[PDB]
Design a protein around this ligand. Structure first.
Ligand SMILES: *[B]([O])([O])[C]([C][C]([C])[C])[N]C(=O)[C]([C]C1=[C][C]=[C][C]=[C]1)[N]C(=O)C1=[C]N=[C][C]=N1
Ligand SMILES: [Mg+2]
Lengths: 222, 233, 250, 212, 244, 240, 235, 231
């Protein structure tokens, strides 16, 4: 019997800062126990200061990103070159995904950018289109390894202030772009060590009011 | 949904400093029966692209006709069909990739794994993969089926990352490909000794080599091997 | 393309006339004379084989046609329109009756089906009415022998005897004097030949006259033996010789 | 999931949890399981996240179109039936929903409809829906009265979700409270279970089984 | 294109009349007269065949009176072929109703259905209307004995006594004069034949130029019998009433 | 299918087919609607050119669309059946989905919408019918009376008439109907409706039909004798 | 006869030009756009005194931020309004935002030329579409049955249009207040109307960013009419 | 005369009058100019207002990052045709990862317009288009007529009084073709060209509409104070 789905591995990570947002993802592409590519870009600039990644089955991932990029193009044509806000993009993606509710895009989608107040924004989707704005989200193969670390080191969960013994929580102070990139790199270094489908390279896209910047880092190739 | 009947095995390929090399054996298998011994699985498109195909041969022949038809269609009302508006490797690939994914989405796939090797207008090397699922990826070395498991490891020792491409000559690259084909003949039970090889260079163009054979094989050591353990005679 | 004539080409005029039906009847009037006579033990239908050229083989053109083993038809008017009606009539006898009830339709119901086809050409989009009047003779178990006329409008009437086409007015008067309710089939054939001679100009023989009967069952024409209940067709077309024999006793 | 809604003297109380799971994996603790269909209508969400989200924000579009066309607020009966008729068309296809449509109008008063992906549409006073519905039912049925204050009703709903959050492994995170009166719904805050449990335990004297 | 040849059968005149309906009614006015008379104990249907011949087989002939079911019959005035199309549709409608509700179709419901079909041909489709007017004679257990008429417009009305076809103006005046509410079937039979005898364009009214039918509760106990009169039976009733 | 554009604009900006449909309404028997303080009355003319009619079974001029709404009309009778049927279906469809019967305004808006659709659809001619739709909204004691016409426009009326000689009876209603004080009772409302028809009808015998609709699905049709008593009382006051 | 989509020798579609004549026979509708809002006003024109004038609905809400006035064969407008309302709500569903007034107008105008031998004829009604969005602020559009739409600072359509347009030419400036615009619509309506203008035979409405689209009460308009009379008698 | 009732009818001299009447609608439209060098291609369009309260009707539509057109005639027909071009440009990109050639875009418009001239029921398009673009063979300018005829040109003009601008370009041919690597000078030549078609009215800030595409210049439209530089 023909199986229309496959698993291309990989892992992605979105973090929303105070006036910035990052969307990271490893560059390894796989099937079963073989490496297809050590550098296959997974996070894409879609225009209008929005970055996107659809992790899971790469064919469905590429199809979805391609169709969203297309939706941005036609949004400009149909509405006098109006900038597609991140919240509007998110709702649009829900309809793209739910449109194939009974033959789903087998992907975990994450977009990142800035909201209309200039603050950092990350949105997260399931394969059939349910979505929610989030401060933090890891997706894909090693998501289970990364999310708990982010609950602890981004939202200061289960952390309290010394001397008070559980009475006073650690205050939720804001994180700089340099601080976030440190947490992203350590997340992927750790994920690479314990997950076989994570490695080769890490590509991070950073979104600010100035535009979209890229950073690349080597990961272990075993 | 179907099953593949007459099938072709590994297609292997890699980038080098001035272009790309691609190769595939000339066998059309019918299960374990090595039925057809003269099947060409590298199909050139113009003088700048070679499409290597593995998997179902009936579907390969269909794809071959689509590409032939693509050249005809591009020539229509196109005074620059042999110049600025000639078919690019990137155009040919994206077309195939579109078809492969559309067919899988109708639950009626073209049961193949395809590698499009070529050189672009600006001299850039093109090498990208697509299969029955519509999955696509690019890499300095690409291989299908058994080639993925056995050829890639050997070809990645020559070009391990992007920066190794300018350091790799056509002689070193071809040598690596020819060696990989020998290894696949040792170890793939659905391979043949006879194969075809294609080089697409940005300077010397398309060189298509037919009727190549695996040579310099090591078998002599077999004479010393006796029994499966304790047997001496 | 597409048939963009989805509207009626036959419409009521201020006077209440349906023009195309009237004009179709005019075409029937110009057509060669045909007639039908009903006897106690049979029915006869007859017409003239008006050959368009002496080089033409008039035997290949059949004006009198078998519809079922016990039903036959003849016409006056446009031959091609008749030919396609016979094709449709033969088919409808199977599709709307024989494939349902396992037997051939009775005369009146097959006539009803033909009439329906001719009515629809009078109301449907983008078509003209059929330019023929049919005379349908037939037999069935419960109704016995019968003879029907069918007009371009789709209207049909049962007749003891009648004529249509060129010299119908004179021929119907001739039949009124000769017809009675005690005629045997041979007597009806004799009267049919007498009536038809009046409307014919040139040669009058078996080769220029087409004549068929609905009479006794013909087991010799069945084609097989072994089933007692199947006794053969009541429709029989008279041969050129059989006509000439009765022209000597004329 | 644990979601509840109940009619009383002061209108309707709606209370939901916040957890979303994929197997044993906790996918989210911050899910909005209540949707604000308009200033007067609320919908709860249980079962498939996408199905509930998509079709309940769709419901808000249909309700808006109704009051544009009819120059009048849509009834809770009519709104709930639009959703139930829609999902009934998709019956068999595999939609997964358990929802309460909660509202207040002049002609109806406070009204709750349980709507279901099998096509079930039920009017009622009390409903609990989700994997932890049985736990919430225990607290509700023993403490429910018509003559509850808005303050006491709000607490009962909060406490009933807490009860389920504790016992049901697929419920938890936090509690979202809503209070529905004539003049629209009124949000009553997000309450983290990690803090609410220790607060309620201490103040109420309950959960003596657990050590704190 | 094709527009050039379109007669446009479904349009209003400047006066607000439907051309084709009006012309269809003109066609019907030349058809043989049909009369229906409703009594307390039954209904009569009488109709005149159009200029017949001595060679017409009358006993197997039917151009005027048709059976829709065991309880309902119709008299036709207009194109016979058009009428048979509608008659077969009506026969099916009656059977559909019987299959659905397991009860015989009420007369009015059948009449409304056929009338609605006629109406459709005047409003849409670009086809010519049916050049037919019906007299419906029927019985059901709600309203009892009922007479209706419908015409190409698709409009229908109920009657105590009514005529369609030729000379309706003269016929309706004669019926209006001699009709009474407490009338019986035997009296209605006589009235129908006397009316035709005076309005006919023929020299004399004979059995071979008539079709006749009665719907009576003159069936053994609480039930209804349809009687399509045979040629010999029409001849006898003509002698009985003193016309021949 | 037959796609021919029958309703089209003319150089002076008129759709003649729609206007000729109004002429068919002008030909139709007169229909009148009057709303009182707690009721609506629908009066209808019956042309006495047709006697020997069976009034038991003959299609009545006023039709119930639901138990709380009625519809009368002027124009082509056969056309009116199609609108009535559609309206009755929509009335049940509304109860099924909204769980509440139609408002008189909604039902009118639907019927008017159907009539409009037939003025710019290919292959069809407009309805030769104008309607008066009357009744009471569910759980509402305010009387409702609406009018529609072939073009598809509709509007609410304190009192209105349509059909032949409607110009005359509208003249009567415009001077006799006071908005500040409408017919307070059923009697007063019926009397004013009969009076208005008597300006046009001829004989007050079987030529006038009256249907009274009251709140909460209370609809009744008056008999010949009941109407005849109104006819008698009106003329006896007139002899002065 | 002749095609419905036929061109005249001058290069105009016969049917579109004829539908414009029908719009000239329609009741007057006026729109004025300001920086404080857009005002929409219409002549009701009841055919008889027995017709309850408050049932005449020639000003209509499309969304909270978009209103619409009509003139001509007003029955034709119902399907245009239905489409407009659906388009507005649908876009909010797909994009979680208000739709641009221009985009809404464009969507309505796409229906216009969908006629042939689709609907059998063009629409016999013109629309004044007024609204507000964040990108282009307060806007007023004139949507015709030709499929064309122009933006306007002020615009009059219907029987008294060219007389009203000439009056709007003189009176409009870029610093008009909302109150000044309200009176200006009432003034020009009163000028071109056959019958004497009052709160029962004329209707006002506006669209502001804060309160959205509002149809004015007959009591509220009556005061603005009284305010108008006094200020005209003031000189 | 008797042969202008529909598009499916030739006249006795072999003319299609409905097509010619559609051509007439273009001549009533406002003037627009197109011209190109080897590096850039420019559109200049005189926009038309209804009155002083009204806006000026937009004349230029973007089809892709590398292609767009200006219109003259029925604006809704230009919207239909530009929408078709947007889809065809987009199909080329999605399927073949290839920017649509300007010549091939012209061929597609020709064939779409032709079908409306040979079939019953339909009508010809009532608009003329000037398509500019930059593809793999450099800058291009096309002129589309609703008869179906598409023509590649160095420069041209369509609309009312377009003959004046067309003559100017015919004189300036050798000059403006050489304006390479200088967008502002190529626009100046276009603004000077369209000025030969003006009478009574002159180019104001909300009257003028300019568009440009080139080697390293995406198709961009200039309106309002962005064109005050060129007035
Ligand atoms: B609740 O537990 O039913 C919850 C409500 C939903 C609206 C968020 N549903 C889920 O958590 C479901 C799984 C499930 C668990 C128990 C019962 C029924 C269903 N999960 C999701 O819908 C889901 C999971 N991962 C990502 C997105 N959505
Ligand atoms: Mg690893």
């Amino acid at each position: 019997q023909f199986n229309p789905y496959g698993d291309n591995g990989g892992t992605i990570l979105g973090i929303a800062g105070e006036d910035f947002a990052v969307l990271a993802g490893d560059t390894r592409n796989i099937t079963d126990y073989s490496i297809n590519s050590r550098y296959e870009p997974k996070v894409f600039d879609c225009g209008d200061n929005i970055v996107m990644s659809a992790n899971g089955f790469a064919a469905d991932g590429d199809a979805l990103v391609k169709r969203f990029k297309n939706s941005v193009k036609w949004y400009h044509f149909d509405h006098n070159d109006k900038k597609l806000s991140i919240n509007s993009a998110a709702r649009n993606i829900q309809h793209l995904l739910y449109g194939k509710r009974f033959f789903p895009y087998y992907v975990h989608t994450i977009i990142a950018g800035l909201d209309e107040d200039g603050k950092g924004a990350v949105y997260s989707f399931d394969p059939v289109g349910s979505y929610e704005r989030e401060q933090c989200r890891a997706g894909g193969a090693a998501a289970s390894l990364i999310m708990p670390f982010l609950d602890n080191q981004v939202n200061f969960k289960n952390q309290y202030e010394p001397g008070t013994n559980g009475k006073v929580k650690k205050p939720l102070k804001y994180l700089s772009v340099e601080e976030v990139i440190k947490l992203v790199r350590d997340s992927f270094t750790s994920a690479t060590e314990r997950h076989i489908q994570v490695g080769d390279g890490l590509e991070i896209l950073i979104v600010t009011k100035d535009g979209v910047r890229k950073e690349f880092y080597e990961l272990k190739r075993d | 949904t179907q099953q593949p009947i007459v099938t072709g095995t590994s297609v292997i390929s890699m980038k080098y400093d001035n272009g790309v090399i691609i190769a595939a054996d000339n066998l059309g298998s019918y299960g374990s029966l090595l039925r057809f011994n003269g099947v060409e699985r590298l199909i050139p498109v113009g003088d700048n692209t070679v499409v290597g195909i593995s998997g179902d041969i009936s579907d390969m022949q269909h794809i071959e006709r689509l590409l032939k038809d693509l050249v005809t269609e591009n020539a229509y009302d196109n005074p620059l069909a042999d110049a600025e508006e000639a078919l690019e490797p990137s155009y040919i690939f994206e077309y195939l990739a579109t078809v492969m994914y559309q067919r899988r989405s109708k639950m009626n796939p073209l049961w193949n794994a395809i590698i499009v090797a070529g050189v672009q207008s600006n001299g850039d090397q093109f090498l990208r993969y697509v299969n029955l699922l519509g999955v696509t990826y690019s890499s300095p070395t690409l291989a299908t089926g058994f080639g993925a498991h056995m050829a890639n490891p050997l070809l990645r020792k020559v070009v391990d990352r992007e920066s190794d491409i300018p350091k790799t000559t056509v002689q070193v690259a071809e040598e690596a490909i020819v060696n990989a084909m020998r290894v696949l003949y040792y170890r793939d039970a659905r391979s043949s000794r006879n194969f075809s090889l294609a080089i697409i260079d940005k300077n010397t163009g398309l060189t298509f080599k037919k009727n190549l054979q695996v040579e310099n094989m090591k078998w002599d050591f077999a004479k010393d091997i006796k029994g499966y353990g304790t047997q001496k005679i | 393309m597409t048939d963009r004539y989805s509207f009626s080409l036959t419409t009521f005029s201020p006077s209440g006339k349906l023009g195309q039906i009237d004009y179709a009847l005019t075409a029937v009037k110009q057509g060669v004379t045909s007639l039908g006579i009903k006897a106690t033990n049979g029915v006869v239908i007859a017409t003239e084989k008006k050959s368009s050229s002496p080089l033409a083989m008039s035997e290949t053109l059949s004006k009198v046609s078998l519809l079922t083993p016990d039903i036959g038809a003849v016409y006056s008017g446009m031959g091609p329109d008749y030919r396609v009606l016979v094709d449709k009539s033969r088919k409808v006898a199977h599709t709307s009756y024989k494939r349902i009830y396992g037997e051939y339709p009775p005369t009146k119901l097959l006539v009803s089906e033909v009439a329906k086809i001719m009515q629809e050409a009078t109301q449907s989009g983008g078509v003209r009415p059929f330019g023929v009047s049919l005379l349908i003779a037939g037999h069935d178990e419960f109704n016995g022998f019968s003879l029907y006329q069918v007009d371009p409008s789709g209207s049909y009437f049962p007749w003891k005897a009648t004529a249509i086409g060129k010299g119908s007015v004179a021929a119907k008067t001739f039949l009124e004097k000769r017809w009675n309710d005690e005629l045997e089939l041979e007597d009806a054939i004799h009267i049919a030949l007498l009536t038809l001679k009046e409307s014919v100009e040139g040669e009058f023989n078996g080769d220029t006259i087409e004549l068929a009967i609905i009479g006794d069952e013909n087991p010799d024409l069945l084609g097989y033996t072994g089933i007692p209940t199947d006794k053969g067709p009541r429709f029989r077309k008279l041969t050129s010789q059989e006509i000439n024999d009765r022209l000597e006793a004329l | 999931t644990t979601t509840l809604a109940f009619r009383f003297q002061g209108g309707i109380i709606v209370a939901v949890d916040s957890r979303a799971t994929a197997g044993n994996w906790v996918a989210s603790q911050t899910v909005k399981k209540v949707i604000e269909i308009n200033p007067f209508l609320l919908g709860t969400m249980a079962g498939g996240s996408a199905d509930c989200q998509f079709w309940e924000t769709w419901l808000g579009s249909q309700c808006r179109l109704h009051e544009l066309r009819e120059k009048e607020r849509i009834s809770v009966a009519a709104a709930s039936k639009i959703l139930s008729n829609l999902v009934y068309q998709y019956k068999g296809a595999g939609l997964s929903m358990g929802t309460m449509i909660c509202g207040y109008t002049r002609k109806e008063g406070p009204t709750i409809y349980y709507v279901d992906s099998d096509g079930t549409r039920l009017k009622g006073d009390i409903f609990c829906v989700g994997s932890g519905q049985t736990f919430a039912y225990g607290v509700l049925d023993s403490n429910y009265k018509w003559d509850l204050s808005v303050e006491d009703a709000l607490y009962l709903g909060k406490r009933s979700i807490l009860a389920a959050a504790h016992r049901d492994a697929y419920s938890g995170g936090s509690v979202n409270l809503y209070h529905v009166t004539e003049d629209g719904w009124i949000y009553h805050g997000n309450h983290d279970v990690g803090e609410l449990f220790w607060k309620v335990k201490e103040e109420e004297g309950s959960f003596n089984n657990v050590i704190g | 294109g094709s527009r050039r040849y379109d007669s446009r059968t479904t349009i209003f005149s400047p006066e607000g009349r439907l051309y084709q309906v009006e012309y269809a009614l003109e066609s019907i006015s030349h058809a043989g007269t049909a009369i229906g008379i409703m009594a307390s104990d039954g209904i009569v249907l009488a109709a005149e065949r159009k200029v017949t011949s001595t060679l017409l087989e009358q006993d197997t002939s039917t151009e005027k009176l048709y059976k829709l079911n065991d309880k309902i019959a119709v008299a036709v005035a207009g194109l016979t072929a058009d009428a048979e199309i509608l008659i077969n549709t009506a026969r099916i409608h009656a059977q559909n109703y019987l299959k659905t509700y397991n009860e015989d179709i009420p007369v009015e419901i059948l009449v409304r259905r056929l009338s609605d079909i006629k109406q459709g041909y005047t409003q849409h489709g670009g086809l010519r209307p049916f050049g037919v007017s019906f007299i419906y004679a029927g019985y059901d257990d709600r309203y009892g004995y009922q007479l209706y008429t419908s015409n190409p417009s698709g409009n229908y009305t109920g009657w105590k006594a009514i005529s369609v076809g030729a000379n309706t103006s003269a016929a309706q005046t004669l019926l209006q004069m001699d009709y009474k509410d407490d009338m019986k079937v035997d009296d209605a039979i006589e009235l129908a034949l006397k009316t035709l005898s005076k309005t006919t364009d023929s020299s004399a009214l004979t059995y071979d130029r008539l079709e006749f039918a009665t719907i009576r509760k003159g069936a053994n106990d609480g039930e209804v019998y349809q009687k399509i009169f045979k040629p010999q039976e029409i001849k006898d009733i003509l002698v009985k009433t003193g016309i021949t | 299918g037959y796609d021919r554009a029958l309703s089209i604009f003319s150089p002076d900006g008129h759709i003649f087919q729609v206007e000729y449909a109004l002429e068919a309404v002008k030909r139709g028997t007169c229909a009148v609607g009057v709303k009182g303080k707690n009721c609506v009355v629908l009066g209808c003319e019956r042309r006495s050119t047709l006697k020997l009619q069976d009034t038991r079974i003959t299609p009545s001029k006023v039709s119930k669309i639901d138990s709380h709404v009625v519809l009368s009309f002027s124009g082509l009778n056969a056309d009116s059946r199609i609108l009535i049927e559609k309206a009755r279906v929509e009335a049940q469809s509304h109860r099924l989905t909204l769980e509440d019967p139609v408002t008189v305004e909604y039902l009118t808006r639907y019927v008017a919408g159907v009539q409009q659709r037939y003025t710019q659809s290919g292959g069809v001619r407009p309805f030769g019918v104008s309607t008066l739709i009357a009744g009471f909204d569910p759980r509402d004691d305010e009387p409702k009376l609406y009018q529609t016409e072939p073009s598809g426009i509709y509007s609410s009326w304190s009192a209105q008439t349509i059909g032949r000689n409607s110009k005359t009876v509208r003249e009567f209603l415009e001077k006799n109907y006071d908005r500040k004080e409408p017919p307070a009772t059923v009697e007063e409302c019926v009397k004013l409706t009969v009076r208005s028809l008597l300006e046009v009808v001829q004989t007050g015998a079987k030529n006038i039909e009256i249907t009274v609709v009251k709140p909460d699905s209370d609809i009744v049709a008056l008999s010949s004798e009941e109407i005849n008593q109104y006819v008698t009382q009106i003329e006896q006051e007139k002899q002065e | 006869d002749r095609g419905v989509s036929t061109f005249s020798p001058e290069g105009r579609l016969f049917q579109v030009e004829y539908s414009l004549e029908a719009i000239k026979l329609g009741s007057t509708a006026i729109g004025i756009a300001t920086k404080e809002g857009v005002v929409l006003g219409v002549e009701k024109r009841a055919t008889s005194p027995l017709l309850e004038s408050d049932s005449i609905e020639k000003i209509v809400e499309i969304d909270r931020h978009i209103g619409c006035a009509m003139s001509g064969l007003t029955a034709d407008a119902r399907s245009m309004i239905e489409h407009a309302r659906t388009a507005a709500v649908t876009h909010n569903l797909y994009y979680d935002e208000d739709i641009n007034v221009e985009s809404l107008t464009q969507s309505v105008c796409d229906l216009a030329l969908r006629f042939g031998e689709l609907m059998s004829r063009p629409f016999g009604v013109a629309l004044l579409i007024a609204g507000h969005d964040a990108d282009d602020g307060y806007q007023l559009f004139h949507a015709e049955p030709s499929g064309t739409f122009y933006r306007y600072n002020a615009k009059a359509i219907g029987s008294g249009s060219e007389g009203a347009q000439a009056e709007l030419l003189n009176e409009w400036h870029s610093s008009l207040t909302l109150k000044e615009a309200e009176l200006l619509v009432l003034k020009i309506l009163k000028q071109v109307m056959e019958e004497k203008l009052d709160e029962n035979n004329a209707q006002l409405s506006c669209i502001t960013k804060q309160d959205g689209f509002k149809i004015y009460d007959n009591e509220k308009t009556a005061e603005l009419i009284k305010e108008l009379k006094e200020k005209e008698a003031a000189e | 005369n008797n042969y202008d009732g529909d598009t499916v009818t030739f006249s006795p001299t072999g003319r299609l009058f409905q097509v010619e009447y559609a051509l007439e609608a273009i001549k009533q439209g406002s003037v627009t100019v197109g011209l190109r060098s080897n590096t850039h291609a420019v559109l200049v369009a005189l926009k038309r207002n209804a009155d002083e309260l009204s806006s000026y009707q937009k004349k230029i539509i973007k089809c892709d990052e590398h292609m767009g057109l200006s219109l003259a005639g029925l604006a809704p027909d230009a919207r239909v045709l530009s929408n078709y071009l947007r889809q065809q440009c987009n199909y080329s990109s999605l399927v073949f990862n290839r920017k649509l050639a300007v010549e091939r875009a012209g061929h597609l418009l020709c064939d779409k317009a032709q079908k409306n001239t040979q079939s019953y029921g339909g009508r010809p398009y009532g608009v003329g288009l000037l398509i500019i673009g930059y593809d793999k063979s450099g800058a291009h300018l096309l002129e589309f007529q609703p008869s179906g005829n598409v023509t590649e040109l160095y420069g041209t003009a369509i609309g009312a009084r377009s003959q004046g601008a067309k003559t100017y370009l015919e004189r300036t041919l050798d000059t403006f073709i050489k304006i390479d690597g200088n967008p502002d000078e190529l626009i100046k030549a276009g603004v000077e060209a369209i000025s030969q078609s003006l009478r009574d009215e002159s180019l104001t800030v909300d009257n003028l509409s300019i568009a440009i595409v080139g080697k390293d210049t995406p198709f961009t439209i200039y309106d309002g104070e962005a064109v005050a530089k060129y007035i």
